[PDB]
Amino acid sequence: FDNPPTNVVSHLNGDWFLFGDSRSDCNHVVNTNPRNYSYMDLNPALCDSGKISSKAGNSIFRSFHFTDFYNYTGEGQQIIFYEGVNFTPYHAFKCTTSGSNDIWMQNKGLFYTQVYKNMAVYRSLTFVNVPYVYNGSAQSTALCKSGSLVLNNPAYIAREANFGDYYYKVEADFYLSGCDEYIVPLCIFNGKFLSNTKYYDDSQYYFNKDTGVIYGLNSTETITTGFDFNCHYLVLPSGNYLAISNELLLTVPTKAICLNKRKDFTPVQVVDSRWNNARQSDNMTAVACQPPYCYFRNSTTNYVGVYDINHGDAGFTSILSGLLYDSPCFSQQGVFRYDNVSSVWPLYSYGRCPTAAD
Amino acid sequence: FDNPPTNVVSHLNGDWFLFGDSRSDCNHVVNTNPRNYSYMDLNPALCDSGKISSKAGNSIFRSFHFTDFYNYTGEGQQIIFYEGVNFTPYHAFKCTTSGSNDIWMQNKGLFYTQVYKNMAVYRSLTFVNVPYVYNGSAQSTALCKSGSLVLNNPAYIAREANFGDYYYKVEADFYLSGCDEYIVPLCIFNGKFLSNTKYYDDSQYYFNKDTGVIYGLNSTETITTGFDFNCHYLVLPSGNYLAISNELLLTVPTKAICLNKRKDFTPVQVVDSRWNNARQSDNMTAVACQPPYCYFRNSTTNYVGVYDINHGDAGFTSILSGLLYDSPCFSQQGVFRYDNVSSVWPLYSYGRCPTAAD
Ligand SMILES: *[C@@H]1O[C@H](CO)[C@@H](O[C@@H]2O[C@H](CO)[C@@H](O)[C@H](O)[C@H]2NC(C)=O)[C@H](O)[C@H]1NC(C)=O
Ligand SMILES: *[C@@H]1O[C@H](CO)[C@@H](O[C@@H]2O[C@H](CO)[C@@H](O)[C@H](O)[C@H]2NC(C)=O)[C@H](O)[C@H]1NC(C)=O
Ligand SMILES: *[C@@H]1O[C@H](CO)[C@@H](O)[C@H](O)[C@H]1NC(C)=O
Ligand SMILES: *[C@@H]1O[C@H](CO)[C@@H](O)[C@H](O)[C@H]1NC(C)=O
Ligand SMILES: *[C@@H]1O[C@H](CO)[C@@H](O)[C@H](O)[C@H]1NC(C)=O
Ligand SMILES: *[C@@H]1O[C@H](CO)[C@@H](O)[C@H](O)[C@H]1NC(C)=O
Ligand SMILES: *[C@@H]1O[C@H](CO)[C@@H](O)[C@H](O)[C@H]1NC(C)=O
Ligand SMILES: *[C@@H]1O[C@H](CO)[C@@H](O)[C@H](O)[C@H]1NC(C)=O
Ligand SMILES: *[C@@H]1O[C@H](CO)[C@@H](O)[C@H](O)[C@H]1NC(C)=O
Ligand SMILES: *[C@@H]1O[C@H](CO)[C@@H](O)[C@H](O)[C@H]1NC(C)=O
Ligand SMILES: *[C@@H]1O[C@H](CO)[C@@H](O)[C@H](O)[C@H]1NC(C)=O
Ligand SMILES: *[C@@H]1O[C@H](CO)[C@@H](O)[C@H](O)[C@H]1NC(C)=O
Numbered sequence: 001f002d003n004p005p006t007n008v009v010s011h012l013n014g015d016w017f018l019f020g021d022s023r024s025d026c027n028h029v030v031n032t033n034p035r036n037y038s039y040m041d042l043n044p045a046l047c048d049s050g051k052i053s054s055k056a057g058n059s060i061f062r063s064f065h066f067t068d069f070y071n072y073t074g075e076g077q078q079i080i081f082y083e084g085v086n087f088t089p090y091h092a093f094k095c096t097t098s099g100s101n102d103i104w105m106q107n108k109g110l111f112y113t114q115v116y117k118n119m120a121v122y123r124s125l126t127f128v129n130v131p132y133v134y135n136g137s138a139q140s141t142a143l144c145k146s147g148s149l150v151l152n153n154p155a156y157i158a159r160e161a162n163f164g165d166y167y168y169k170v171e172a173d174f175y176l177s178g179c180d181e182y183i184v185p186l187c188i189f190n191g192k193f194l195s196n197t198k199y200y201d202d203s204q205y206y207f208n209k210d211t212g213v214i215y216g217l218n219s220t221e222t223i224t225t226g227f228d229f230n231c232h233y234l235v236l237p238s239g240n241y242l243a244i245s246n247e248l249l250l251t252v253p254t255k256a257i258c259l260n261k262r263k264d265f266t267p268v269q270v271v272d273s274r275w276n277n278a279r280q281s282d283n284m285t286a287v288a289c290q291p292p293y294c295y296f297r298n299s300t301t302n303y304v305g306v307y308d309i310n311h312g313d314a315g316f317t318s319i320l321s322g323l324l325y326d327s328p329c330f331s332q333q334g335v336f337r338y339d340n341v342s343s344v345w346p347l348y349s350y351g352r353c354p355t356a357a358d
Numbered sequence: 359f360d361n362p363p364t365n366v367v368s369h370l371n372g373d374w375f376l377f378g379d380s381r382s383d384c385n386h387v388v389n390t391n392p393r394n395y396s397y398m399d400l401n402p403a404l405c406d407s408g409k410i411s412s413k414a415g416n417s418i419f420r421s422f423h424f425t426d427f428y429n430y431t432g433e434g435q436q437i438i439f440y441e442g443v444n445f446t447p448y449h450a451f452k453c454t455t456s457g458s459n460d461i462w463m464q465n466k467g468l469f470y471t472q473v474y475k476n477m478a479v480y481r482s483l484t485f486v487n488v489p490y491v492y493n494g495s496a497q498s499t500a501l502c503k504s505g506s507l508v509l510n511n512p513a514y515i516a517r518e519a520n521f522g523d524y525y526y527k528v529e530a531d532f533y534l535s536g537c538d539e540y541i542v543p544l545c546i547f548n549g550k551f552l553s554n555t556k557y558y559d560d561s562q563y564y565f566n567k568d569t570g571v572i573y574g575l576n577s578t579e580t581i582t583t584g585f586d587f588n589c590h591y592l593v594l595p596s597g598n599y600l601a602i603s604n605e606l607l608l609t610v611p612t613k614a615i616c617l618n619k620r621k622d623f624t625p626v627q628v629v630d631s632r633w634n635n636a637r638q639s640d641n642m643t644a645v646a647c648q649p650p651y652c653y654f655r656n657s658t659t660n661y662v663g664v665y666d667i668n669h670g671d672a673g674f675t676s677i678l679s680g681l682l683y684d685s686p687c688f689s690q691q692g693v694f695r696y697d698n699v700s701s702v703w704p705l706y707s708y709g710r711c712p713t714a715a716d
């Protein structure tokens with residue numbers, strides 16, 4: 001008899017949900033000709049489950065920040081993630097041509113940290129539009145973009161007519177309703193930002209009008225190039241807020257991760273989302289995925305897909321195959337198929353776990 | 359054979375530490391005449407262990423905020439707490455005679471939340487003085503006090519000569535060094551605060567000069583009485599900060615909980631700290647102590663001490679008796695003395711835990 005920790009994502013019972021990309025997007029098949037499911041690491045037998053929210057070409061972080069949006073939506077006791085690759089160093093995103101992808105990688109890490117920690121304690125994830133009102137005549141402007149990637153959260157608001165510089169203070173009201181909590185971005189250009197001969201230090205506050213909490217960021221970097229848009233990801237309660245800009249462009253959330261239905265602490269499961277080695281990926285979801293709130297799973301091999309080089313891999317197929325059955329015990333070392341006896345002690349465990357005793 | 363969850367605090371191995379009050383203060387015996395150890399719930403056999411930091415009459419929260427200070431200091435993989443009672447509704451603390459103890463109870467809850475969560479991930483706790491520099495000629499002032507309790511963290515700084523009201527903006531620099539992280543208070547009077555015919559709305563920011571993060575609180579309450587000094591407990595990194603007051607009195611930290619030596623996640627154990635029923639206690643440490651980071655233990659009886667009514671209780675003695683031996687498994691339901699078989703599945707477990715399987 002053998003009850004080793006196995007390298008899969010699974011579920012204690014039927015109460016689970018997976019968030020993904022093309023490698024688990026059952027709907028993508030209609031855009032394959034001929035129709036072929038092999039682009040998936042997910043077993044298509046799960047295509048009718050109602051337990052997956054995945055979109056080819058997308059990722060939760062991508063959708064959170066950019067116009068290339070998919071309304072990831074799902075609910076489960078145990079939450080599983082297999083996405084992230086669709087925002088990687090490969091995409092070489094930077095707000096401007098003189099920016100830094102490293103900043104965007106740092107953002108990615110901070111985002112998924114909040115997502116993983118919070119989905120250990122809420123059943124439900126979706127996206128909600130965040131309404132805001134700005135009183136001036138200036139409109140939103142797409143100042144952060146690169147290739148086909150256009151940032152739209154937070155929004156930037158253009159300077160008013162009548163101002164000649166960026167030393168102005170302006171504000172907007174944004175309102176959060178419909179969720180227990182909300183993940184929103186608070187961002188600044190962190191660097192010496194040149195505009196018409198003057199160097200700016202971006203400053204942005206958000207203010208909960210009723211709790212009285214001020215959350216702010218001011219630029220502190222001295223470099224005049226190779227800097228970018230640094231974001232923090234706030235986890236906020238419902239209420240009415242001001243976005244108060246003290247320098248450069250006013251920024252205000254336009255989308256939030258909507259967290260609902262508080263649950264008993266239940267660690268999330270996260271599968272490494274990377275390209276075949278020929279493209280540059282990152283380890284930001286690995287950094288984000290820590291005990292006790294997250295179990296991280298990865299294959300021991302290069303990602304070599306059979307449909308194309310980046311889709312349909314033996315190693316990841318195997319990891320996801322655990323979704324085809326119930327398993328009693330989840331641990332840092334893996335998933336145990338039996339709840340009785342083992343030869344290793346499950347670490348940071350959840351479920352009905354075996355003893356490594358005599 | 360029986361392996362039930364037992365209602366004790368214990369330790370997997372020798373690597374543990376307890377923080378306490380008189381009920382575990384071995385040094386207090388010298389102030390008993392004749393010398394009598396019965397005032398303790400702790401077994402005096404543990405008096406030579408070097409694993410306890412306790413002080414009669416005190417509590418971590420009491421020491422954090424007030425002049426009645428004890429430099430709680432300790433290091434351990436598993437941290438245990440048996441204190442809190444020395445700041446309870448019984449003490450009826452409020453900053454002023456028109457204040458609210460409920461505010462102070464809320465503060466207490468928020469404080470211990472940060473302490474418990476963080477001692478699940480650091481080995482070492484102590485207190486450090488926080489140096490600050492204020493540039494004006496005004497001095498600190500003891501504006502918050504009641505009975506023998508005098509608040510000294512955060513400090514209040516008096517108004518300068520030359521100001522006739524409290525609509526002024528002033529600041530201080532405070533510096534955090536010597537720890538991986540620091541718990542400090544950020545507080546305001548949350549209410550309409552009357553001074554010489556004018557009503558104030560206290561405003562306080564802290565600013566990390568190098569990370570650029572602004573942490574602020576502004577008063578939002580409309581009540582003109584029955585309000586008090588609301589505190590939030592920030593967990594900050596080392597660095598150089600400004601305390602920027604925008605209204606009422608400038609407040610600045612004078613003490614921090616000093617957190618050191620990052621460790622693998624290890625839930626803390628917390629024992630209910632209450633008076634005999636004849637005095638008013640609170641459940642704030644219970645609220646603070648949640649899975650996965652904390653196990654809460656309580657007796658099923660009134661606290662009836664044998665030394666005096668508030669010291670040396672059978673129920674709490676029993677809970678603490680588990681410190682006299684190693685135990686393999688810690689769980690929400692209790693401590694399991696054996697790591698092999700049981701009849702219940704350990705929840706949120708840590709250590710070598712039994713199976714409830716066949
Ligand atoms: C954050 O940045 C803002 C904007 O740069 C700072 O506010 C400005 O501070 C300078 C003083 O250095 C003044 O000249 C401006 O009038 C201020 N603008 C305002 C208030 O709109 C702000 O003080 C910084 N926040 C801190 C340091 O906590
Ligand atoms: C927090 O409170 C402060 C102090 O009351 C606010 O700053 C003052 O705002 C009023 C405008 O209502 C002005 O009359 C004062 O000149 C401001 N004082 C300063 C800047 O020292 C502050 O705006 C509030 N913070 C918010 C709303 O985020
Ligand atoms: C995402 O879908 C959810 C569930 O239908 C809906 O409430 C929410 O408004 C959607 N968010 C969008 C379209 O931004
Ligand atoms: C996943 O495993 C592969 C193959 O061992 C390795 O190259 C890669 O760095 C791992 N990814 C992370 C995020 O650890
Ligand atoms: C991620 O990569 C960095 C190197 O860039 C490394 O120092 C870090 O430990 C890695 N973390 C994980 C969790 O793989
Ligand atoms: C799907 O593509 C895979 C990999 O290219 C290949 O094995 C197979 O020919 C295709 N299957 C069908 C039914 O066309
Ligand atoms: C553990 O469970 C498996 C499957 O039921 C069984 O074959 C094995 O003998 C069991 N071992 C025990 C109870 O020691
Ligand atoms: C508490 O004791 C520790 C350890 O000796 C010391 O570093 C620290 O300064 C003390 N804190 C005080 C006296 O505030
Ligand atoms: C501890 O138990 C006693 C006796 O059952 C009960 O009265 C008390 O409320 C409990 N305290 C907390 C904080 O739950
Ligand atoms: C603490 O007491 C309040 C009533 O004041 C109650 O609503 C709350 O559930 C209690 N919490 C715990 C953890 O005992
Ligand atoms: C200590 O006090 C306890 C409780 O009052 C009592 O049983 C005993 O007389 C005392 N013990 C000694 C050695 O004096
Ligand atoms: C569990 O351990 C206890 C103490 O060693 C022993 O008496 C009992 O029989 C064991 N039961 C098992 C291994 O089933």
Ligand SMILES: [K+]
Nearest residue numbers: 203204245249
């Ligand atoms: K701004």
Ligand SMILES: [K+]
Nearest residue numbers: 561562603607
């Ligand atoms: K103040």
